[PDB]
């Protein structure tokens, strides 16, 4: 896989901001609050969120697009594992993952 260039990184920031602005992204914007989900961090061993990804983007943590996609997929995988399939939180992952794929393919 090809290294992420500085030109690549402008695109990644755009993709990330498109997701952060999505109406369904709210449960993913910041780390889960342990007060609203007291067992969350006993269940989910590798939490991830969009603020933690923004930090990594800004600090050029990602060297390959696959690593960026892997962090994003953890967000969605964590959500569907923690939540039952009829929860509104689960529905956020359904909507935002397919939005992400649309944007990812564009990033191309
Ligand atoms: C009850 N189920 C839930 C609850 C939450 C949650 C709760 C409070 C929160 N405060 C700041 C973020 C934040 C996220 N996130 C999910 S998630 C990431 O979609 O798996 N599922």
PDB file of C-alpha atoms and ligand atoms in Angstrom:
ATOM      1  CA  UNK A   1       0.000   0.000   0.000  1.00  0.00           C
ATOM      2  CA  UNK A   2       1.168   3.518  -0.813  1.00  0.00           C
ATOM      3  CA  UNK A   3       2.328   6.033   1.848  1.00  0.00           C
ATOM      4  CA  UNK A   4      -0.019   8.872   2.757  1.00  0.00           C
ATOM      5  CA  UNK A   5       1.359  12.074   1.290  1.00  0.00           C
ATOM      6  CA  UNK A   6       0.718  15.598   2.493  1.00  0.00           C
ATOM      7  CA  UNK A   7      -1.774  15.870  -0.377  1.00  0.00           C
ATOM      8  CA  UNK A   8      -3.354  12.655   0.911  1.00  0.00           C
ATOM      9  CA  UNK A   9      -3.650  14.171   4.377  1.00  0.00           C
ATOM     10  CA  UNK A  10      -5.771  17.096   3.171  1.00  0.00           C
ATOM     11  CA  UNK A  11      -8.191  14.521   1.780  1.00  0.00           C
ATOM     12  CA  UNK A  12      -8.218  12.538   5.026  1.00  0.00           C
ATOM     13  CA  UNK A  13      -9.038  15.669   7.018  1.00  0.00           C
ATOM     14  CA  UNK A  14     -11.919  16.342   4.623  1.00  0.00           C
ATOM     15  CA  UNK A  15     -13.270  12.805   5.004  1.00  0.00           C
ATOM     16  CA  UNK A  16     -13.042  13.008   8.782  1.00  0.00           C
ATOM     17  CA  UNK A  17     -14.844  16.361   8.875  1.00  0.00           C
ATOM     18  CA  UNK A  18     -17.605  14.998   6.605  1.00  0.00           C
ATOM     19  CA  UNK A  19     -18.173  12.250   9.171  1.00  0.00           C
ATOM     20  CA  UNK A  20     -17.998  14.563  12.195  1.00  0.00           C
ATOM     21  CA  UNK A  21     -20.690  16.760  10.575  1.00  0.00           C
ATOM     22  CA  UNK A  22     -23.089  13.883   9.860  1.00  0.00           C
ATOM     23  CA  UNK A  23     -26.397  13.993  11.728  1.00  0.00           C
ATOM     24  CA  UNK A  24     -25.833  10.439  12.994  1.00  0.00           C
ATOM     25  CA  UNK A  25     -22.225  10.858  14.145  1.00  0.00           C
ATOM     26  CA  UNK A  26     -22.859  12.228  17.637  1.00  0.00           C
ATOM     27  CA  UNK A  27     -22.158   9.035  19.658  1.00  0.00           C
ATOM     28  CA  UNK A  28     -18.791   8.788  17.836  1.00  0.00           C
ATOM     29  CA  UNK A  29     -17.504  12.342  18.211  1.00  0.00           C
ATOM     30  CA  UNK A  30     -15.717  11.874  21.566  1.00  0.00           C
ATOM     31  CA  UNK A  31     -14.762   8.883  23.718  1.00  0.00           C
ATOM     32  CA  UNK A  32     -17.741   7.209  25.311  1.00  0.00           C
ATOM     33  CA  UNK A  33     -18.527   8.808  28.646  1.00  0.00           C
ATOM     34  CA  UNK A  34     -18.096   6.173  31.384  1.00  0.00           C
ATOM     35  CA  UNK A  35     -20.957   7.863  33.282  1.00  0.00           C
ATOM     36  CA  UNK A  36     -23.461   7.194  30.490  1.00  0.00           C
ATOM     37  CA  UNK A  37     -22.119   3.650  29.892  1.00  0.00           C
ATOM     38  CA  UNK A  38     -20.570   2.328  33.114  1.00  0.00           C
ATOM     39  CA  UNK A  39     -19.775  -1.111  31.691  1.00  0.00           C
ATOM     40  CA  UNK A  40     -18.615   0.166  28.301  1.00  0.00           C
ATOM     41  CA  UNK A  41     -14.909  -0.051  28.997  1.00  0.00           C
ATOM     42  CA  UNK A  42     -15.178  -3.524  30.490  1.00  0.00           C
ATOM     43  CA  UNK A  43     -16.803  -4.687  27.247  1.00  0.00           C
ATOM     44  CA  UNK A  44     -14.809  -2.857  24.559  1.00  0.00           C
ATOM     45  CA  UNK A  45     -11.102  -3.587  24.653  1.00  0.00           C
ATOM     46  CA  UNK A  46      -9.960  -1.181  21.877  1.00  0.00           C
ATOM     47  CA  UNK A  47     -12.231   1.881  22.018  1.00  0.00           C
ATOM     48  CA  UNK A  48     -11.974   4.387  19.200  1.00  0.00           C
ATOM     49  CA  UNK A  49     -13.679   7.662  18.324  1.00  0.00           C
ATOM     50  CA  UNK A  50     -13.481  10.493  15.832  1.00  0.00           C
ATOM     51  CA  UNK A  51     -11.734  12.971  18.145  1.00  0.00           C
ATOM     52  CA  UNK A  52      -9.000  10.414  18.792  1.00  0.00           C
ATOM     53  CA  UNK A  53      -8.719   9.898  15.020  1.00  0.00           C
ATOM     54  CA  UNK A  54      -8.582  13.677  14.452  1.00  0.00           C
ATOM     55  CA  UNK A  55      -5.698  13.862  16.918  1.00  0.00           C
ATOM     56  CA  UNK A  56      -3.880  11.097  15.031  1.00  0.00           C
ATOM     57  CA  UNK A  57      -4.525  12.808  11.688  1.00  0.00           C
ATOM     58  CA  UNK A  58      -3.192  16.135  12.969  1.00  0.00           C
ATOM     59  CA  UNK A  59      -0.092  14.380  14.386  1.00  0.00           C
ATOM     60  CA  UNK A  60       0.424  12.393  11.119  1.00  0.00           C
ATOM     61  CA  UNK A  61       0.031   9.101  13.016  1.00  0.00           C
ATOM     62  CA  UNK A  62      -1.172   7.243   9.907  1.00  0.00           C
ATOM     63  CA  UNK A  63       1.379   6.071   7.354  1.00  0.00           C
ATOM     64  CA  UNK A  64      -0.997   3.985   5.167  1.00  0.00           C
ATOM     65  CA  UNK A  65      -4.667   4.426   4.315  1.00  0.00           C
ATOM     66  CA  UNK A  66      -5.376   0.913   5.626  1.00  0.00           C
ATOM     67  CA  UNK A  67      -4.478   2.116   9.146  1.00  0.00           C
ATOM     68  CA  UNK A  68      -6.958   4.989   8.911  1.00  0.00           C
ATOM     69  CA  UNK A  69      -9.662   2.622   7.643  1.00  0.00           C
ATOM     70  CA  UNK A  70      -8.856   0.193  10.467  1.00  0.00           C
ATOM     71  CA  UNK A  71      -9.424   2.851  13.163  1.00  0.00           C
ATOM     72  CA  UNK A  72     -12.659   3.901  11.513  1.00  0.00           C
ATOM     73  CA  UNK A  73     -13.878   0.318  11.292  1.00  0.00           C
ATOM     74  CA  UNK A  74     -13.205  -0.140  15.030  1.00  0.00           C
ATOM     75  CA  UNK A  75     -15.644   2.691  15.752  1.00  0.00           C
ATOM     76  CA  UNK A  76     -18.374   0.893  13.826  1.00  0.00           C
ATOM     77  CA  UNK A  77     -17.451  -2.603  15.012  1.00  0.00           C
ATOM     78  CA  UNK A  78     -17.364  -1.436  18.655  1.00  0.00           C
ATOM     79  CA  UNK A  79     -20.800   0.166  18.323  1.00  0.00           C
ATOM     80  CA  UNK A  80     -22.531  -2.905  16.863  1.00  0.00           C
ATOM     81  CA  UNK A  81     -20.919  -5.252  19.388  1.00  0.00           C
ATOM     82  CA  UNK A  82     -21.846  -3.123  22.401  1.00  0.00           C
ATOM     83  CA  UNK A  83     -25.384  -2.277  21.281  1.00  0.00           C
ATOM     84  CA  UNK A  84     -28.279  -4.513  20.243  1.00  0.00           C
ATOM     85  CA  UNK A  85     -29.316  -4.304  16.625  1.00  0.00           C
ATOM     86  CA  UNK A  86     -32.507  -2.367  17.437  1.00  0.00           C
ATOM     87  CA  UNK A  87     -30.845   0.410  19.338  1.00  0.00           C
ATOM     88  CA  UNK A  88     -30.577   3.923  17.893  1.00  0.00           C
ATOM     89  CA  UNK A  89     -26.854   3.802  18.627  1.00  0.00           C
ATOM     90  CA  UNK A  90     -26.505   0.721  16.434  1.00  0.00           C
ATOM     91  CA  UNK A  91     -28.367   2.521  13.662  1.00  0.00           C
ATOM     92  CA  UNK A  92     -25.730   5.262  13.774  1.00  0.00           C
ATOM     93  CA  UNK A  93     -23.092   2.709  12.797  1.00  0.00           C
ATOM     94  CA  UNK A  94     -25.212   1.339   9.957  1.00  0.00           C
ATOM     95  CA  UNK A  95     -25.742   4.816   8.498  1.00  0.00           C
ATOM     96  CA  UNK A  96     -22.276   6.233   9.135  1.00  0.00           C
ATOM     97  CA  UNK A  97     -20.347   3.182   7.971  1.00  0.00           C
ATOM     98  CA  UNK A  98     -22.038   3.241   4.586  1.00  0.00           C
ATOM     99  CA  UNK A  99     -21.543   7.025   4.392  1.00  0.00           C
ATOM    100  CA  UNK A 100     -17.863   6.457   5.219  1.00  0.00           C
ATOM    101  CA  UNK A 101     -17.521   3.895   2.430  1.00  0.00           C
ATOM    102  CA  UNK A 102     -19.020   6.378  -0.029  1.00  0.00           C
ATOM    103  CA  UNK A 103     -16.512   9.015   1.065  1.00  0.00           C
ATOM    104  CA  UNK A 104     -13.614   6.537   1.257  1.00  0.00           C
ATOM    105  CA  UNK A 105     -14.208   5.420  -2.329  1.00  0.00           C
ATOM    106  CA  UNK A 106     -14.199   9.052  -3.397  1.00  0.00           C
ATOM    107  CA  UNK A 107     -10.924   9.580  -1.544  1.00  0.00           C
ATOM    108  CA  UNK A 108      -9.729   6.873  -3.877  1.00  0.00           C
TER     109      UNK A 108
HETATM  110  C1  LIG B   1     -25.949   3.335  25.394  1.00  0.00           C
HETATM  111  N1  LIG B   1     -25.200   3.009  24.192  1.00  0.00           N
HETATM  112  C2  LIG B   1     -24.166   3.886  23.699  1.00  0.00           C
HETATM  113  C3  LIG B   1     -23.838   5.083  24.347  1.00  0.00           C
HETATM  114  C4  LIG B   1     -22.816   5.871  23.812  1.00  0.00           C
HETATM  115  C5  LIG B   1     -22.361   7.198  24.438  1.00  0.00           C
HETATM  116  C6  LIG B   1     -22.925   7.634  25.640  1.00  0.00           C
HETATM  117  C7  LIG B   1     -22.513   8.832  26.221  1.00  0.00           C
HETATM  118  C8  LIG B   1     -21.509   9.623  25.605  1.00  0.00           C
HETATM  119  N2  LIG B   1     -20.946  10.805  25.968  1.00  0.00           N
HETATM  120  C9  LIG B   1     -20.041  11.155  25.072  1.00  0.00           C
HETATM  121  C10 LIG B   1     -19.976  10.196  24.060  1.00  0.00           C
HETATM  122  C11 LIG B   1     -20.940   9.206  24.429  1.00  0.00           C
HETATM  123  C12 LIG B   1     -21.363   7.974  23.833  1.00  0.00           C
HETATM  124  N3  LIG B   1     -22.209   5.435  22.738  1.00  0.00           N
HETATM  125  C13 LIG B   1     -22.563   4.293  22.177  1.00  0.00           C
HETATM  126  S1  LIG B   1     -21.685   3.803  20.702  1.00  0.00           S
HETATM  127  C14 LIG B   1     -20.161   4.777  20.653  1.00  0.00           C
HETATM  128  O1  LIG B   1     -22.577   4.047  19.552  1.00  0.00           O
HETATM  129  O2  LIG B   1     -21.366   2.378  20.761  1.00  0.00           O
HETATM  130  N4  LIG B   1     -23.508   3.502  22.618  1.00  0.00           N
END
